Amino acid sequence: QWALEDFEIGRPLGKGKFGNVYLAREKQSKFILALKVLFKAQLEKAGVEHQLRREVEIQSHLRHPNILRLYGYFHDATRVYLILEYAPLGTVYRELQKLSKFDEQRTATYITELANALSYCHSKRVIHRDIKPENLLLGSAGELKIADFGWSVHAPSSRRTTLAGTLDYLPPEMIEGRMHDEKVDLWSLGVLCYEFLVGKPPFEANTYQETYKRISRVEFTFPDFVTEGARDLISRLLKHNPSQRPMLREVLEHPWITANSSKPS
Numbered sequence: 001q002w003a004l005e006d007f008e009i010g011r012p013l014g015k016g017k018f019g020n021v022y023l024a025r026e027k028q029s030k031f032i033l034a035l036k037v038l039f040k041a042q043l044e045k046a047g048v049e050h051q052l053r054r055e056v057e058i059q060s061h062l063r064h065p066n067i068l069r070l071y072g073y074f075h076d077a078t079r080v081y082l083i084l085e086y087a088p089l090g091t092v093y094r095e096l097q098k099l100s101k102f103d104e105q106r107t108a109t110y111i112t113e114l115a116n117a118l119s120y121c122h123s124k125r126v127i128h129r130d131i132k133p134e135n136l137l138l139g140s141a142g143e144l145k146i147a148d149f150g151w152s153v154h155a156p157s158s159r160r161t162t163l164a165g166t167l168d169y170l171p172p173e174m175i176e177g178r179m180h181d182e183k184v185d186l187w188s189l190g191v192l193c194y195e196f197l198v199g200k201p202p203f204e205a206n207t208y209q210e211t212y213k214r215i216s217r218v219e220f221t222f223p224d225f226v227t228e229g230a231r232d233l234i235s236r237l238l239k240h241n242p243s244q245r246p247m248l249r250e251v252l253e254h255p256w257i258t259a260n261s262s263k264p265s
């Protein structure tokens with residue numbers, strides 16, 4: 001069906017481990033979209049074909065305003081191309097680098113949008129497992145969209161692939177290679193809420209080996225400016241024992257989220 005010849009390619013939108021992502025326009029319709037380019041030698045080398053397949057199958061069948069659409073894919077003997085919805089206001093990561101920290105109202109609205117999207121995923125027993133600022137994109141009204149389903153799965157699960165880069169968003173069960181379920185996305189939602197308010201994630205350290213210790217002990221503290229209601233929410237989410245983390249309905253109905261968020265359930 002689609003091939004490269006059908007698109008005019010434009011400026012680079014970003015880079016990941018594998019993905020080189022470009023703005024593009026479809027020639028006959030003039031439809032503007034994002035083309036995510038993957039090199040086949042590099043997918044074969046890392047042995048992550050099953051991850052690409054999961055990304056395509058899970059993301060193309062989900063439909064939610066706070067989840068990024070995938071429309072299709074094609075392939076050309078050196079490259080695989082994923083046809084994505086274009087997010088014009090860029091990443092939450094870039095926005096945090098611009099502002100240093102978010103205020104309480106911005107933070108609670110993003111958390112509501114995230115918990116809405118995750119509640120929808122979990123209702124299909126899809127776990128994302130890689131929630132972090134560079135995988136959250138922003139639509140034309142500034143609304144948050146989860147993207148990058150390459151690590152996503154059905155629960156319950158173990159981890160059969162090597163963690164590559166940062167431990168900062170992963171919970172204890174996951175870094176210790178244990179078994180895990182839906183509740184890992186709850187833990188990453190705690191880490192995000194802290195990083196939005198403070199400017200850095202709560203277990204950040206200078207080495208892999210020390211980050212690993214801080215996470216497995218849940219060693220975090222709060223700066224004076226973080227309010228009592230923020231603290232309460234974050235402290236309920238960052239629990240070592242996954243079963244004690246709240247359900248997402250409890251997150252969306254937490255008093256501090258209802259006082260501060262400018263969007264609903």
Ligand SMILES: Nc1ncnc2c1ncn2[C@@H]1O[C@H](COP(=O)(O)OP(=O)(O)O)[C@@H](O)[C@H]1O
Pocket residue numbers: 013014015016017018019020021034036068084085086087088090091134135137147148150
């Ligand atoms: N649909 C898109 N619209 C705008 N920018 C995007 C989009 N998808 C990816 N990007 C940019 O490209 C980066 C890498 O995309 P990603 O899908 O997260 O690749 P990887 O799987 O390699 O992490 C993102 O962090 C963001 O900067």
Ligand SMILES: CCc1ccc(OCC(=O)N2CCCCC2)cc1
Pocket residue numbers: 002026031033071072083
């Ligand atoms: C090749 C470029 C391309 C573009 C679009 C597409 O589907 C578009 C589509 O379903 N909607 C439906 C929701 C609103 C508009 C987008 C498939 C391929």
Ligand SMILES: [Mg+2]
Pocket residue numbers: 016134135148
């Ligand atoms: Mg990514």
Ligand SMILES: [Mg+2]
Pocket residue numbers: 016018148149150151
């Ligand atoms: Mg990926």
